[PDB]
Each structure stands twice: as structure tokens, then as C-alpha cells.
Scaffold this active site. Structure first.
Site, mmCIF file in Angstrom:
data_model
loop_
_atom_site.group_PDB
_atom_site.id
_atom_site.type_symbol
_atom_site.label_atom_id
_atom_site.label_comp_id
_atom_site.label_asym_id
_atom_site.label_seq_id
_atom_site.Cartn_x
_atom_site.Cartn_y
_atom_site.Cartn_z
ATOM 1 N N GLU A 67 -6.285 -31.399 -13.143
ATOM 2 C CA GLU A 67 -6.683 -32.297 -14.228
ATOM 3 C C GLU A 67 -6.638 -31.612 -15.595
ATOM 4 O O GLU A 67 -6.745 -30.388 -15.692
ATOM 5 C CB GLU A 67 -8.083 -32.877 -13.973
ATOM 6 C CG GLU A 67 -9.119 -31.870 -13.484
ATOM 7 C CD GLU A 67 -10.547 -32.299 -13.769
ATOM 8 O OE1 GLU A 67 -11.278 -31.533 -14.433
ATOM 9 O OE2 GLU A 67 -10.947 -33.399 -13.327
ATOM 10 N N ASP B 186 12.511 -29.550 -17.532
ATOM 11 C CA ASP B 186 11.882 -30.842 -17.240
ATOM 12 C C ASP B 186 11.572 -31.668 -18.488
ATOM 13 O O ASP B 186 10.473 -32.218 -18.626
ATOM 14 C CB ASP B 186 10.615 -30.657 -16.392
ATOM 15 C CG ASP B 186 10.287 -31.885 -15.556
ATOM 16 O OD1 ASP B 186 9.096 -32.087 -15.238
ATOM 17 O OD2 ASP B 186 11.151 -32.708 -15.177
#
Ligand SMILES: OCCNc1ncnc2oc(-c3ccccc3)c(-c3ccccc3)c12
Length: 272
Positions: A21, A126
Site C-alpha cells: 500500500e 513500464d
């Protein structure tokens, strides 16, 4: 000397991913806002150590800043620059995109970041709107170097063989060839991001001959959905970026020479 300057309050969660997270951290004294990436090492001890290593090298206005890292037991905490504007993804309206001046400014800032990364011999691997974050002033920042690697060391280029990234943003050569150059791969993904910004849709699931949408592009069927919504000038740049052969693909020094790239479209700040 300041007694409570090291204390940081976790206000709210910014998003929950696969590794863990990301939380909004606000300083006790100064009220400075930073983002903290929480990754469980016991629930990857290899992919995170390289991420910290790369982040330590980087210092650029269009790259998410790295402040430091804390190793509290098993959990690794990554202190990063807070980007309040969120992801570029959420600024793309589905099936329409965004105003061309907005897309150009974002693309300018993206190129600036990629040029810096390639100059220091690192490739992101990415590039996608989800990994392109916006600050308070809507400045683009490249984020998440968890898939990033060194492609140039001591002025010697290393060819890549690892297959990674995201299929819709991936260059054809990494699906087709055993080894490939790093730079044209990042260039290709930047082109897909540009397509997304200007059309509000991804052209194909993957750049393969088995993909009908990709085959139509090689056949120059620009009258079809994504390309027909773009406009000749930026489409002409897209024709140079989305080239199957990575050796014939446009480089960034040449993207900076492109007609649309240098076309005046965007005004400054609102009366400031
Ligand atoms: O650097 C990767 C960690 N992510 C971030 N880093 C640095 N600043 C950030 O601001 C955000 C963010 C900001 C405003 C709204 C929503 C998210 C996020 C955020 C976190 C989780 C998932 C996606 C985006 C973020």
C-alpha cells in the site's frame, strides 16, 4: 534540535497495490506531505532492493523524488515525493482523451524525464499513464522504478532479454526477439501513452501479428477508431514512433525535431 521533526502522521491511504500500500504521510511540525510506499518483504527481497538502488541515483524535475528508506523489521518503507494531482490515467477521458495542448505539455514533460533516465543509463520498462503522476501544478512525474534496470554501465550498452512491462504498452520486439535494445522499448511505450492521451483508448491488447488491430496499423488503416480521432500532425509522429523495427524506430533526439512536438498549442498559467 526540533523535538518532533522526525514524526510523520499517516493520514489516508492513497492506493492499495500488489506489493502492499501507499499512504499519505504528513509531518507533525512542518505539515509537509510525503508519500510512503509500504512493501512486504516476507509477503520479495530482490525486486525492492533494486528499486531503492535506482531511486538513489535519480534527481530530476519529471521524476518522483526519493527522500529515503526505513527498514523497520521486515516491512520496507519508501519515502517519495507526494503528487497530489494523481495519475495521468484519470485525466484521460474514455474514448475521447484530452485537449491536444494538454497532451503535448504532458508528452514534453514525459520526454524530459525519459531523456534524463536514458542519459544516466537506466530504463523504466513500464511507462503507462498509471505510472505517470501529477503534482499540484499538474507537472508530470515518472513513478515506480520496481521494474527499472541498468542498460548502460561504464559507457557499455547491455542488451535486455527479460520480458516485463504491460502488454498494451509493450514493444513488439520483446515479444518477438530473444534480445533487444532498451531505449526503443521506452520510446514505443511513450507512443502508446500519446495514443491514449489523444484518443482515450488503447490501440491493441498486444503488438502481435495475431492481433487484428495491430495488423491494421501495419496496413496503415488510419481510418479506423483510434487513429481517425487524432489529427494529422500528432498522427505523423505516431507513425514514426510505432514502427515495428526498433532499429528504424525514431529516437528521442529526433522526436524533439518533430513538427507536432514543436507546434505552438498551449498557453501558460491562468493570468500568472
Ligand atoms: O511512486 C509510486 C507510489 N505512488 C505515489 N507516489 C507518490 N505520490 C503519489 O500520490 C498518489 C496519489 C495522489 C493523489 C490521489 C491518489 C494517489 C500516489 C498513488 C498511490 C497509490 C496508487 C497510485 C498512486 C502516489
Amino acid at each position: 534540535a526540533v523535538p518532533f521533526v522526525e514524526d510523520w502522521d499517516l493520514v489516508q491511504t492513497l492506493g492499495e497495490g500488489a506489493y502492499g500500500e501507499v499512504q499519505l504521510a504528513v509531518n507533525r511540525v512542518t505539515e509537509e506531505a510525503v508519500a510512503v510506499k509500504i512493501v512486504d518483504m516476507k509477503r520479495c527481497p530482490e525486486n525492492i532492493k533494486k528499486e531503492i538502488c535506482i531511486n538513489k541515483m535519480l534527481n530530476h524535475e519529471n521524476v518522483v523524488k526519493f527522500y529515503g528508506h526505513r527498514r523497520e523489521g521486515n516491512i520496507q518503507y519508501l519515502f517519495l515525493e507526494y503528487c497530489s494531482g494523481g495519475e495521468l490515467f484519470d485525466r484521460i477521458e474514455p474514448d475521447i482523451g484530452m485537449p491536444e495542448p494538454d497532451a503535448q505539455r504532458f508528452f514534453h514533460q514525459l520526454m524530459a524525464g525519459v531523456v534524463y533516465l536514458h542519459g544516466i543509463g537506466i530504463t523504466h520498462r513500464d511507462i503507462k499513464p498509471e505510472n505517470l503522476l501529477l503534482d499540484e501544478r499538474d507537472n508530470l512525474k515518472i513513478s515506480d522504478f520496481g521494474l527499472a534496470t541498468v542498460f548502460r554501465y561504464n559507457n557499455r550498452e547491455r542488451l535486455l532479454n527479460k520480458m516485463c512491462g504491460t502488454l498494451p504498452y509493450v514493444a513488439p520486439e520483446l515479444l518477438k526477439r530473444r534480445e533487444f535494445h532498451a531505449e526503443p522499448v521506452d520510446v514505443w511505450s511513450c507512443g502508446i501513452v500519446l495514443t491514449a492521451m489523444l484518443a482515450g483508448e488503447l490501440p491493441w491488447d498486444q503488438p502481435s501479428d495475431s492481433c487484428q488491430e495491430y495488423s491494421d496499423w501495419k496496413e496503415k488503416k488510419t481510418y479506423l477508431n483510434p487513429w481517425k480521432k487524432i489529427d494529422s500532425a500528432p498522427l505523423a509522429l505516431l507513425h514514426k514512433i510505432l514502427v515495428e523495427n526498433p532499429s528504424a524506430r525514431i529516437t528521442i533526439p529526433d522526436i524533439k525535431k518533430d513538427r507536432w512536438y514543436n507546434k505552438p498549442l498551449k498557453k501558460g498559467a491562468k493570468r500568472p
